[PDB]
Every structure is written in C-alpha cells, then in structure tokens.
Amino acid sequence: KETAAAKFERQHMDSSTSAASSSNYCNQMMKSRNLTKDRCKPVNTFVHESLADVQAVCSQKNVACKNGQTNCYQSYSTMSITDCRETGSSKYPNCAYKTTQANKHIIVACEGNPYVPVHFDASV
C-alpha cells in the first residue's frame, strides 16, 4: 500500500546527511532503501534537501520529460544530490555502485492531488 509519492521519498530522498556521502554510501543506501531486492537498479539519485524544497519543484520550471510527457519540472536552484551507478563488475545479489556527489538542478515528474514528485527524471 506504498503510494507513488511515498516510493519517491524512499527511492530518492535523503535529507539526513548534508551530503557527506562516503565512497560506500550508494552500496549501503541502495540496499537499505530496498532498491536491490529483485535485482540491482542500474542508476538512482538521492537528494539531500528538505522534503518541502523537493516537493516545491512541482511548481517550478516546466520542462519536457525524457518520455515525452509534460509533467516534469526543473528546480530553479541547484540541489545537493548523490548519483549511484552500478559498477561494471556488480553481481546480484552483491550489488555494487559508484557514488558521486554533486550540486545540480533536479528534474522530477509530478502527479496527483496533492501534486507531488513521483519520478526522478534527470539532473542537469
């Protein structure tokens, strides 16, 4: 009974660290957030901003989504993020990732009422 909005928080929000992500952050976070249960999710981004700040992006700059839908929004301000990208030698269930911290604008897709983030589209 996890909502799409709740899933976005689980998969992409990490407001509890002001970004200080160790080289093992993704290995730990990808498993702790259940993104390596059925397999190793290839790529996934975590956002280190407050929940309110990320939810606010749904009212920010409307930009085309990678899938062609019109429900994507880019943050006006840059945000603290961590990208997780499965290593070339990662072998499920031993999911291995490279951790890369950055400060970039995020692009999320929003749906529902309230209109909230449900998908992480890209960082730019």
Ligand SMILES: Nc1ncnc2c1ncn2[C@@H]1O[C@H](COP(=O)(O)OP(=O)(O)O)[C@@H](O)[C@H]1O
């Ligand atoms: N424009 C969009 N592009 C991609 N997915 C979208 C879009 N708008 C809504 N969604 C929904 O967002 C959800 C994304 O879920 P999931 O694949 O688990 O996480 P993520 O895409 O954030 O890694 C799906 O229910 C999908 O249909």
